[PDB]
Paper text:
In addition, the cap fulfills numerous other biological functions that are mediated by specific cap-binding proteins and include maturation, transport, and [name]-mediated translation initiation. Upon binding the cap, the [name] protein changed its conformation from open to closed, bringing the Trp102 and Trp56 closer to the cap, and together with the structural water molecules, stapling the ligand with the protein structure. Finally, to gain more insight into the consequences at the molecular level of N7-benzylation of the [name] cap, we determined the crystal structures of three compounds with [name]. Overall, the comparison of these three crystal structures indicated that different benzyl substituents can be accommodated in the cap binding pocket due to (i) the conformational flexibility of Trp102, which was also previously observed for m7GMP analogs, and (ii) the presence of structural water molecules in the N7-methyl-binding cavity, which could be replaced upon introduction of larger hydrophobic substituents.
One of the interesting examples is a dinucleotide cap analog carrying a benzyl group instead of methyl at the N7-position ([name]). The modification slightly increased affinity for [name], and when incorporated into [name], conferred almost twofold higher translation efficiency in vitro relative to m7GpppG-capped mRNAs, making it a good candidate for augmenting the properties of synthetic mRNAs. Crystal structures were refined using diffraction data to the resolution of 2.2 Å for 1a, 2.67 Å for 1c, and 2.66 Å for 1h. In the 1a–[name] complex the residue was flipped by 180° compared to the m7GpppG–[name] complex, but still participated in stacking interactions with modified guanine ring (the distance between the Bn7G plane and the parallelly aligned aromatic ring of Trp102 was approximately 3.5 Å). In the case of the benzyl modified cap 1a, for which the benzyl ring was directed upwards, most of the structural water molecules were conserved in the cavity, while for 3-MeBn7GpppG and 4-Cl-[name] the benzyl rings were directed downwards into the cavity, and the structural water molecules were replaced by 3-methylbenzyl rings or 4-chlorobenzyl substituents. The guanosine of 4-Cl-[name] was not visible in the crystal structure, while the guanosines of [name] and 3-MeBn7GpppG were stabilized by interactions with amino acids from the loop comprised of residues 50–59. Specifically, backbone carbonyl oxygen atoms of lysine 54 and 52 formed hydrogen bonds with N1 and N2 of guanine, respectively, and amide group (NH2) of Asn59 was a donor in a hydrogen bond with O6 of guanosine.
Residue numbers in the entry: 32 to 207, 210 to 217
Write the structure that this text describes.
Amino acid sequence: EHYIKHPLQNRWALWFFKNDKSKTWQANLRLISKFDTVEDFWALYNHIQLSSNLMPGCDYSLFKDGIEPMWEDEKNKRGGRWLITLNKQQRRSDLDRFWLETLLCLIGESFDDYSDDVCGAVVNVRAKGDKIAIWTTECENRDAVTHIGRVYKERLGLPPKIVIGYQSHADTATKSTTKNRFVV
Ligand SMILES: Nc1nc2c(ncn2[C@@H]2O[C@H](COP(=O)([O-])OP(=O)([O-])OP(=O)([O-])OC[C@H]3O[C@@H](n4c[n+](Cc5ccccc5)c5c(=O)nc(N)[nH]c54)[C@H](O)[C@@H]3O)[C@@H](O)[C@H]2O)c(=O)[nH]1
């Protein structure tokens, strides 16, 4: 009846975004819960919906405690994201897998000397095509951004034929195509 808890390096918060066009974007975001142990992560993951079962327009976000999953956050305003784009068939094939490995990538501190630059990750469930992104705190840190993208792409088994791009939040938020600051 003894249950050991394995600590994580950081405390993490899972966020949920609901699809509702009658409310503003900020009003559709809500905090689910937080955790800082391996056991509490799986407890949360095992009782929430899989990403492939979300209604279109919904998001999941896992960010470090104190960072909100929005581009106006103080830890995100100068940063950016490595973006992955999936087709419709990739949803049943790879969406749930890619998201779980992403979650374990985050909470495992798998980015060597640049783990502190990581802010979180977001998965968007969209009818036009699902997206998964890992957010970093500073888009001008070339060593941090390129290292995080290389580790992330390899840890998710993506073939080298597919090229993933990094984009600044400030550039994305003012888009009137969002150019890539880096490619891996
Ligand atoms: N009323 C109502 N309308 C909604 C709602 N959701 C969509 N629409 C409208 O629906 C139509 C079709 O687009 P869509 O279905 O493709 O939504 P999308 O596919 O999600 O596109 P998006 O990603 O361009 O986001 C679209 C807009 O969402 C707001 N947004 C998104 N992020 C997350 C975010 C963070 C970093 C990088 C990129 C994104 C943030 C953020 O961090 N901080 C703030 N302040 N705003 C953020 C912002 O305004 C953005 O321009 C369009 O007219 C939409 O405006 C809604 O909740 N309510």
